Amino acid sequence: NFVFGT
Amino acid sequence: NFVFGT
Amino acid sequence: NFVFGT
Amino acid sequence: NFVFGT
Amino acid sequence: NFVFGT
Amino acid sequence: NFVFGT
Amino acid sequence: NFVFGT
Amino acid sequence: NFVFGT
Amino acid sequence: NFVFGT
Amino acid sequence: NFVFGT
Amino acid sequence: NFVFGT
Amino acid sequence: NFVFGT
Amino acid sequence: NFVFGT
Amino acid sequence: NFVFGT
Amino acid sequence: NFVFGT
Amino acid sequence: NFVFGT
């Protein structure tokens, strides 16, 4: 899994 | 803002 | 793990 | 789970 | 304001 | 765990 | 200003 | 836990 | 004023 | 422990 | 400004 | 002025 | 865990 | 102000 | 451990 | 001015 919020 | 994760 | 920033 | 509110 | 968590 | 800020 | 961490 | 009020 | 703690 | 200040 | 890491 | 520590 | 508030 | 910790 | 500053 | 370390 990965999460990448900007 | 940011959110980063695994 | 996660990092969260304003 | 994660929560990210700004 | 902010809320961050897991 | 959580962090909450005004 | 207030920050609370669990 | 931590508390940070200013 | 301030309040700091754990 | 806590510290409180006016 | 706030950054929290799990 | 007052500071109190537990 | 880490906390970084400025 | 600041709060730093682990 | 934590450090807190005004 | 105040700094507190745990």
mmCIF file of N, CA and C in Angstrom:
data_model
loop_
_atom_site.group_PDB
_atom_site.id
_atom_site.type_symbol
_atom_site.label_atom_id
_atom_site.label_comp_id
_atom_site.label_asym_id
_atom_site.label_seq_id
_atom_site.Cartn_x
_atom_site.Cartn_y
_atom_site.Cartn_z
ATOM 1 N N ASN A 1 0.875 -1.188 0.000
ATOM 2 C CA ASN A 1 0.000 0.000 0.000
ATOM 3 C C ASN A 1 0.906 1.230 0.000
ATOM 4 N N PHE A 2 0.458 2.324 -0.598
ATOM 5 C CA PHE A 2 1.076 3.601 -0.286
ATOM 6 C C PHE A 2 0.034 4.699 -0.448
ATOM 7 N N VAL A 3 0.295 5.799 0.254
ATOM 8 C CA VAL A 3 -0.519 6.982 0.236
ATOM 9 C C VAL A 3 0.377 8.188 -0.046
ATOM 10 N N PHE A 4 -0.069 9.054 -0.955
ATOM 11 C CA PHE A 4 0.720 10.210 -1.367
ATOM 12 C C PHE A 4 -0.215 11.385 -1.633
ATOM 13 N N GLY A 5 -0.396 12.223 -0.625
ATOM 14 C CA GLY A 5 -1.280 13.363 -0.711
ATOM 15 C C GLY A 5 -0.495 14.643 -0.534
ATOM 16 N N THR A 6 -0.663 15.569 -1.473
ATOM 17 C CA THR A 6 -0.022 16.859 -1.405
ATOM 18 C C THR A 6 -1.004 17.945 -1.858
ATOM 19 N N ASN B 1 -0.068 21.252 2.800
ATOM 20 C CA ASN B 1 -0.306 20.083 3.658
ATOM 21 C C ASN B 1 0.190 18.842 2.909
ATOM 22 N N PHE B 2 0.373 17.736 3.638
ATOM 23 C CA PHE B 2 0.754 16.507 2.993
ATOM 24 C C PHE B 2 0.467 15.323 3.905
ATOM 25 N N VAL B 3 0.262 14.169 3.259
ATOM 26 C CA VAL B 3 0.188 12.902 3.972
ATOM 27 C C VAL B 3 0.931 11.874 3.124
ATOM 28 N N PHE B 4 1.887 11.204 3.765
ATOM 29 C CA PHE B 4 2.705 10.204 3.080
ATOM 30 C C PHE B 4 2.723 8.945 3.931
ATOM 31 N N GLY B 5 2.606 7.764 3.327
ATOM 32 C CA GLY B 5 2.623 6.597 4.191
ATOM 33 C C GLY B 5 2.605 5.308 3.443
ATOM 34 N N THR B 6 2.952 4.257 4.187
ATOM 35 C CA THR B 6 2.717 2.868 3.727
ATOM 36 C C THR B 6 2.247 1.956 4.846
ATOM 37 N N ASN C 1 4.410 3.148 8.063
ATOM 38 C CA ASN C 1 4.265 4.355 8.894
ATOM 39 C C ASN C 1 3.843 5.516 8.014
ATOM 40 N N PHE C 2 3.360 6.552 8.684
ATOM 41 C CA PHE C 2 2.835 7.729 8.028
ATOM 42 C C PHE C 2 3.503 8.975 8.590
ATOM 43 N N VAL C 3 3.550 10.005 7.744
ATOM 44 C CA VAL C 3 3.815 11.363 8.206
ATOM 45 C C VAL C 3 2.697 12.234 7.659
ATOM 46 N N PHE C 4 2.283 13.180 8.491
ATOM 47 C CA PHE C 4 1.228 14.126 8.179
ATOM 48 C C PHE C 4 1.755 15.526 8.459
ATOM 49 N N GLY C 5 1.470 16.468 7.555
ATOM 50 C CA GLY C 5 1.897 17.828 7.788
ATOM 51 C C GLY C 5 0.832 18.824 7.406
ATOM 52 N N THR C 6 0.779 19.917 8.171
ATOM 53 C CA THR C 6 -0.020 21.054 7.814
ATOM 54 C C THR C 6 0.542 21.771 6.571
ATOM 55 N N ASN D 1 -5.701 2.129 9.040
ATOM 56 C CA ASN D 1 -6.576 3.317 9.040
ATOM 57 C C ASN D 1 -5.670 4.546 9.040
ATOM 58 N N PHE D 2 -6.118 5.640 8.442
ATOM 59 C CA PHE D 2 -5.500 6.918 8.753
ATOM 60 C C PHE D 2 -6.542 8.016 8.592
ATOM 61 N N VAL D 3 -6.281 9.115 9.294
ATOM 62 C CA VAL D 3 -7.094 10.298 9.276
ATOM 63 C C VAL D 3 -6.199 11.505 8.993
ATOM 64 N N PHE D 4 -6.645 12.371 8.085
ATOM 65 C CA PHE D 4 -5.856 13.527 7.673
ATOM 66 C C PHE D 4 -6.791 14.702 7.407
ATOM 67 N N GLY D 5 -6.971 15.540 8.414
ATOM 68 C CA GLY D 5 -7.856 16.680 8.329
ATOM 69 C C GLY D 5 -7.071 17.960 8.506
ATOM 70 N N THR D 6 -7.239 18.886 7.566
ATOM 71 C CA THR D 6 -6.598 20.176 7.635
ATOM 72 C C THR D 6 -7.580 21.261 7.181
ATOM 73 N N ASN E 1 -6.644 24.569 11.840
ATOM 74 C CA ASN E 1 -6.882 23.399 12.698
ATOM 75 C C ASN E 1 -6.386 22.159 11.949
ATOM 76 N N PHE E 2 -6.203 21.053 12.677
ATOM 77 C CA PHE E 2 -5.821 19.823 12.032
ATOM 78 C C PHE E 2 -6.109 18.639 12.945
ATOM 79 N N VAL E 3 -6.313 17.485 12.298
ATOM 80 C CA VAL E 3 -6.388 16.219 13.012
ATOM 81 C C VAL E 3 -5.645 15.191 12.164
ATOM 82 N N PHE E 4 -4.689 14.521 12.805
ATOM 83 C CA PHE E 4 -3.871 13.521 12.119
ATOM 84 C C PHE E 4 -3.853 12.262 12.971
ATOM 85 N N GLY E 5 -3.970 11.081 12.366
ATOM 86 C CA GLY E 5 -3.953 9.914 13.231
ATOM 87 C C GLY E 5 -3.971 8.625 12.483
ATOM 88 N N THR E 6 -3.624 7.574 13.226
ATOM 89 C CA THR E 6 -3.859 6.184 12.767
ATOM 90 C C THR E 6 -4.329 5.272 13.886
ATOM 91 N N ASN F 1 -2.166 6.465 17.103
ATOM 92 C CA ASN F 1 -2.311 7.672 17.934
ATOM 93 C C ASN F 1 -2.733 8.833 17.053
ATOM 94 N N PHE F 2 -3.216 9.869 17.724
ATOM 95 C CA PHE F 2 -3.741 11.046 17.068
ATOM 96 C C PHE F 2 -3.073 12.292 17.629
ATOM 97 N N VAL F 3 -3.026 13.322 16.784
ATOM 98 C CA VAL F 3 -2.761 14.680 17.246
ATOM 99 C C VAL F 3 -3.879 15.550 16.699
ATOM 100 N N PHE F 4 -4.292 16.496 17.531
ATOM 101 C CA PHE F 4 -5.348 17.442 17.219
ATOM 102 C C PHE F 4 -4.821 18.843 17.499
ATOM 103 N N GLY F 5 -5.105 19.785 16.595
ATOM 104 C CA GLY F 5 -4.679 21.144 16.828
ATOM 105 C C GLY F 5 -5.744 22.140 16.445
ATOM 106 N N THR F 6 -5.797 23.233 17.211
ATOM 107 C CA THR F 6 -6.596 24.370 16.853
ATOM 108 C C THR F 6 -6.034 25.088 15.610
ATOM 109 N N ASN G 1 -3.977 28.844 21.402
ATOM 110 C CA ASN G 1 -3.510 27.769 20.510
ATOM 111 C C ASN G 1 -3.410 26.512 21.350
ATOM 112 N N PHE G 2 -3.796 25.373 20.777
ATOM 113 C CA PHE G 2 -3.737 24.155 21.544
ATOM 114 C C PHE G 2 -3.448 22.982 20.618
ATOM 115 N N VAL G 3 -2.537 22.113 21.047
ATOM 116 C CA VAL G 3 -2.311 20.829 20.406
ATOM 117 C C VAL G 3 -2.381 19.752 21.485
ATOM 118 N N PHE G 4 -3.107 18.683 21.169
ATOM 119 C CA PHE G 4 -3.249 17.529 22.059
ATOM 120 C C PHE G 4 -2.834 16.277 21.298
ATOM 121 N N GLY G 5 -1.966 15.471 21.892
ATOM 122 C CA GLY G 5 -1.632 14.192 21.323
ATOM 123 C C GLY G 5 -2.029 13.074 22.259
ATOM 124 N N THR G 6 -2.609 12.016 21.695
ATOM 125 C CA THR G 6 -2.979 10.867 22.480
ATOM 126 C C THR G 6 -1.762 10.006 22.814
ATOM 127 N N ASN H 1 0.878 10.562 25.677
ATOM 128 C CA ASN H 1 0.003 11.750 25.677
ATOM 129 C C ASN H 1 0.909 12.980 25.677
ATOM 130 N N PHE H 2 0.461 14.074 25.079
ATOM 131 C CA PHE H 2 1.079 15.352 25.391
ATOM 132 C C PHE H 2 0.037 16.449 25.229
ATOM 133 N N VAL H 3 0.298 17.549 25.931
ATOM 134 C CA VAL H 3 -0.516 18.732 25.913
ATOM 135 C C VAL H 3 0.379 19.939 25.631
ATOM 136 N N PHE H 4 -0.066 20.804 24.723
ATOM 137 C CA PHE H 4 0.723 21.960 24.310
ATOM 138 C C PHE H 4 -0.212 23.135 24.044
ATOM 139 N N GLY H 5 -0.393 23.974 25.052
ATOM 140 C CA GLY H 5 -1.277 25.114 24.967
ATOM 141 C C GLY H 5 -0.493 26.394 25.144
ATOM 142 N N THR H 6 -0.660 27.320 24.204
ATOM 143 C CA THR H 6 -0.019 28.610 24.272
ATOM 144 C C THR H 6 -1.001 29.695 23.819
ATOM 145 N N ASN I 1 -0.065 33.003 28.478
ATOM 146 C CA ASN I 1 -0.303 31.833 29.336
ATOM 147 C C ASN I 1 0.193 30.592 28.587
ATOM 148 N N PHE I 2 0.376 29.487 29.315
ATOM 149 C CA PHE I 2 0.757 28.257 28.670
ATOM 150 C C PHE I 2 0.470 27.073 29.583
ATOM 151 N N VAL I 3 0.265 25.919 28.936
ATOM 152 C CA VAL I 3 0.191 24.653 29.649
ATOM 153 C C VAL I 3 0.933 23.624 28.801
ATOM 154 N N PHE I 4 1.890 22.955 29.442
ATOM 155 C CA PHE I 4 2.708 21.955 28.757
ATOM 156 C C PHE I 4 2.725 20.695 29.608
ATOM 157 N N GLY I 5 2.609 19.515 29.004
ATOM 158 C CA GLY I 5 2.626 18.347 29.869
ATOM 159 C C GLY I 5 2.608 17.059 29.120
ATOM 160 N N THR I 6 2.955 16.008 29.864
ATOM 161 C CA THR I 6 2.720 14.618 29.404
ATOM 162 C C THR I 6 2.249 13.706 30.524
ATOM 163 N N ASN J 1 4.413 14.899 33.741
ATOM 164 C CA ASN J 1 4.268 16.105 34.571
ATOM 165 C C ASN J 1 3.846 17.267 33.691
ATOM 166 N N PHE J 2 3.363 18.303 34.361
ATOM 167 C CA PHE J 2 2.838 19.480 33.706
ATOM 168 C C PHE J 2 3.506 20.725 34.267
ATOM 169 N N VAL J 3 3.553 21.756 33.422
ATOM 170 C CA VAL J 3 3.818 23.113 33.884
ATOM 171 C C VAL J 3 2.700 23.984 33.336
ATOM 172 N N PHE J 4 2.286 24.930 34.169
ATOM 173 C CA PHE J 4 1.231 25.876 33.856
ATOM 174 C C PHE J 4 1.758 27.277 34.136
ATOM 175 N N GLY J 5 1.473 28.219 33.233
ATOM 176 C CA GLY J 5 1.899 29.578 33.465
ATOM 177 C C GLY J 5 0.835 30.574 33.083
ATOM 178 N N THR J 6 0.782 31.667 33.848
ATOM 179 C CA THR J 6 -0.017 32.804 33.491
ATOM 180 C C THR J 6 0.545 33.522 32.248
ATOM 181 N N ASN K 1 2.598 25.528 12.362
ATOM 182 C CA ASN K 1 3.066 24.453 11.470
ATOM 183 C C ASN K 1 3.166 23.195 12.311
ATOM 184 N N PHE K 2 2.780 22.056 11.738
ATOM 185 C CA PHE K 2 2.839 20.838 12.504
ATOM 186 C C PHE K 2 3.128 19.666 11.578
ATOM 187 N N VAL K 3 4.039 18.796 12.008
ATOM 188 C CA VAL K 3 4.265 17.513 11.367
ATOM 189 C C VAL K 3 4.195 16.436 12.445
ATOM 190 N N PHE K 4 3.469 15.366 12.129
ATOM 191 C CA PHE K 4 3.327 14.213 13.019
ATOM 192 C C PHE K 4 3.741 12.960 12.258
ATOM 193 N N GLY K 5 4.610 12.155 12.852
ATOM 194 C CA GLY K 5 4.944 10.875 12.284
ATOM 195 C C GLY K 5 4.547 9.757 13.219
ATOM 196 N N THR K 6 3.967 8.700 12.655
ATOM 197 C CA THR K 6 3.597 7.551 13.440
ATOM 198 C C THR K 6 4.814 6.690 13.774
ATOM 199 N N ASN L 1 2.601 37.278 38.039
ATOM 200 C CA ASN L 1 3.069 36.203 37.147
ATOM 201 C C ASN L 1 3.169 34.946 37.988
ATOM 202 N N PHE L 2 2.783 33.806 37.415
ATOM 203 C CA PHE L 2 2.842 32.589 38.182
ATOM 204 C C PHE L 2 3.131 31.416 37.256
ATOM 205 N N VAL L 3 4.042 30.546 37.685
ATOM 206 C CA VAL L 3 4.268 29.263 37.044
ATOM 207 C C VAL L 3 4.198 28.186 38.123
ATOM 208 N N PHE L 4 3.472 27.117 37.806
ATOM 209 C CA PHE L 4 3.329 25.963 38.696
ATOM 210 C C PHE L 4 3.744 24.711 37.936
ATOM 211 N N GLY L 5 4.613 23.905 38.530
ATOM 212 C CA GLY L 5 4.947 22.625 37.961
ATOM 213 C C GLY L 5 4.550 21.508 38.897
ATOM 214 N N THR L 6 3.970 20.450 38.332
ATOM 215 C CA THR L 6 3.600 19.301 39.117
ATOM 216 C C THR L 6 4.817 18.440 39.452
ATOM 217 N N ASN M 1 7.454 7.246 16.638
ATOM 218 C CA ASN M 1 6.579 8.434 16.638
ATOM 219 C C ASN M 1 7.485 9.664 16.638
ATOM 220 N N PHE M 2 7.036 10.757 16.040
ATOM 221 C CA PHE M 2 7.655 12.035 16.351
ATOM 222 C C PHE M 2 6.613 13.133 16.190
ATOM 223 N N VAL M 3 6.874 14.233 16.892
ATOM 224 C CA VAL M 3 6.060 15.415 16.874
ATOM 225 C C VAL M 3 6.955 16.622 16.591
ATOM 226 N N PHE M 4 6.510 17.488 15.683
ATOM 227 C CA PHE M 4 7.298 18.644 15.271
ATOM 228 C C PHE M 4 6.364 19.819 15.005
ATOM 229 N N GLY M 5 6.183 20.657 16.012
ATOM 230 C CA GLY M 5 5.299 21.797 15.927
ATOM 231 C C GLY M 5 6.083 23.077 16.104
ATOM 232 N N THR M 6 5.916 24.003 15.164
ATOM 233 C CA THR M 6 6.557 25.293 15.233
ATOM 234 C C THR M 6 5.575 26.379 14.779
ATOM 235 N N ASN N 1 6.511 29.686 19.438
ATOM 236 C CA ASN N 1 6.273 28.516 20.296
ATOM 237 C C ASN N 1 6.769 27.276 19.547
ATOM 238 N N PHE N 2 6.951 26.170 20.276
ATOM 239 C CA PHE N 2 7.333 24.941 19.630
ATOM 240 C C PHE N 2 7.046 23.756 20.543
ATOM 241 N N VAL N 3 6.841 22.603 19.896
ATOM 242 C CA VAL N 3 6.767 21.336 20.610
ATOM 243 C C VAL N 3 7.509 20.308 19.762
ATOM 244 N N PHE N 4 8.466 19.638 20.403
ATOM 245 C CA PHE N 4 9.284 18.638 19.717
ATOM 246 C C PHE N 4 9.301 17.379 20.569
ATOM 247 N N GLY N 5 9.185 16.198 19.964
ATOM 248 C CA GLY N 5 9.202 15.031 20.829
ATOM 249 C C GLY N 5 9.183 13.742 20.081
ATOM 250 N N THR N 6 9.531 12.691 20.824
ATOM 251 C CA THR N 6 9.296 11.302 20.365
ATOM 252 C C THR N 6 8.825 10.389 21.484
ATOM 253 N N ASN O 1 10.989 11.582 24.701
ATOM 254 C CA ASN O 1 10.844 12.789 25.532
ATOM 255 C C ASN O 1 10.422 13.950 24.651
ATOM 256 N N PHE O 2 9.939 14.986 25.322
ATOM 257 C CA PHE O 2 9.413 16.163 24.666
ATOM 258 C C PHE O 2 10.082 17.409 25.227
ATOM 259 N N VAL O 3 10.129 18.439 24.382
ATOM 260 C CA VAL O 3 10.394 19.797 24.844
ATOM 261 C C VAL O 3 9.276 20.668 24.297
ATOM 262 N N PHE O 4 8.862 21.613 25.129
ATOM 263 C CA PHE O 4 7.807 22.560 24.817
ATOM 264 C C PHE O 4 8.334 23.960 25.097
ATOM 265 N N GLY O 5 8.049 24.902 24.193
ATOM 266 C CA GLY O 5 8.475 26.261 24.426
ATOM 267 C C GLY O 5 7.411 27.258 24.044
ATOM 268 N N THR O 6 7.358 28.350 24.809
ATOM 269 C CA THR O 6 6.559 29.487 24.452
ATOM 270 C C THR O 6 7.120 30.205 23.208
ATOM 271 N N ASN P 1 9.177 33.962 29.000
ATOM 272 C CA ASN P 1 9.645 32.887 28.108
ATOM 273 C C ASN P 1 9.745 31.629 28.948
ATOM 274 N N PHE P 2 9.359 30.490 28.375
ATOM 275 C CA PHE P 2 9.418 29.272 29.142
ATOM 276 C C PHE P 2 9.707 28.100 28.216
ATOM 277 N N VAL P 3 10.617 27.230 28.645
ATOM 278 C CA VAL P 3 10.844 25.946 28.004
ATOM 279 C C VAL P 3 10.773 24.870 29.083
ATOM 280 N N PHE P 4 10.048 23.800 28.767
ATOM 281 C CA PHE P 4 9.905 22.647 29.657
ATOM 282 C C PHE P 4 10.320 21.394 28.896
ATOM 283 N N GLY P 5 11.189 20.589 29.490
ATOM 284 C CA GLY P 5 11.522 19.309 28.921
ATOM 285 C C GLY P 5 11.126 18.191 29.857
ATOM 286 N N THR P 6 10.546 17.133 29.293
ATOM 287 C CA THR P 6 10.176 15.985 30.078
ATOM 288 C C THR P 6 11.393 15.124 30.412
#
